[PDB]
């Protein structure tokens, strides 16, 4: 009943495919200037309200994740996901989802 | 000879199966309120004296370990392995055992 790495990979790709569905659906009916959905190799981040922290429940399809927690991103007023201060990567906090962080 | 990854996994399973014996024995012959033996995926921690640092030599069955150093745990006065301050994982210092610290 414990997942293998191969089963985990397959579930990731299915979630990735559904993320492409969401992206394609949103790009077909845009409105306003929010943070756009995107795939970060783990979950599909949703439309982000500009100027707010966006919280997503730790994906249920990741076994080693605490499914009672949330991962966090930052959406600035311009509708762009904020980068890490002093680095060139999108800021994201997954500390609630794993025990080793 | 330089040992393989699969061989390292085997010796760990041998040590893990041996830890289960030690744990099953002490559970049959309990006394006091010390820290109980635990398997942490690397080594089998022994009975810990409450309120003291517990030092275990870096196990000899780990090839990449400095077998002259020690790993450390903390046993509080209640007979429980101390957690890391600010986190929900048991505290352990393996810096002596590895070179990447």
């Amino acid at each position: 009943d414990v997942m293998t790495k191969e089963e985990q990979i397959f579930l990731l790709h299915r979630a990735q495919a559904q993320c492409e569905k969401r992206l394609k659906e949103v790009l077909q009916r845009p409105a306003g200037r929010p943070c756009l959905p995107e795939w970060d190799h783990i979950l599909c981040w949703p439309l982000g309200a500009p100027g707010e922290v966006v919280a997503v429940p730790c994906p249920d399809y990741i076994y080693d994740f605490n499914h009672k927690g949330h991962a966090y991103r930052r959406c600035d007023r311009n509708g762009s996901w904020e980068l890490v201060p002093g680095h060139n990567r999108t800021w994201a906090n997954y500390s609630e989802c794993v025990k080793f962080l | 000879d330089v040992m393989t990854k699969e061989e390292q996994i085997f010796l760990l399973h041998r040590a893990q199966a041996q830890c289960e014996k030690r744990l099953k024995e002490v559970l049959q012959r309990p006394a006091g309120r010390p820290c109980l033996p635990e398997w942490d995926h690397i080594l089998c921690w022994p009975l810990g004296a409450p309120g003291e640092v517990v030092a275990v030599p870096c196990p000899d069955y780990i090839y990449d370990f400095n077998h002259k150093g020690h790993a450390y745990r903390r046993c509080d006065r209640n007979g429980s392995w101390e957690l890391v301050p600010g986190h929900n994982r048991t505290w352990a210092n393996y810096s002596e055992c590895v070179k990447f610290l």
Binding site: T4, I42, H87, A92, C97, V98, L101 | -
Partner: peptide, 22 residues
């Protein structure tokens, strides 16, 4: 080991994921 092979693959996908200051 498979539970660790899957959990180590957790570690890498963490690394590639959690970008906030550690």
């Amino acid at each position: 080991y498979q539970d660790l092979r899957r959990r180590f693959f957790x570690h890498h996908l963490x690394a590639e994921x959690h970008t906030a200051e550690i």
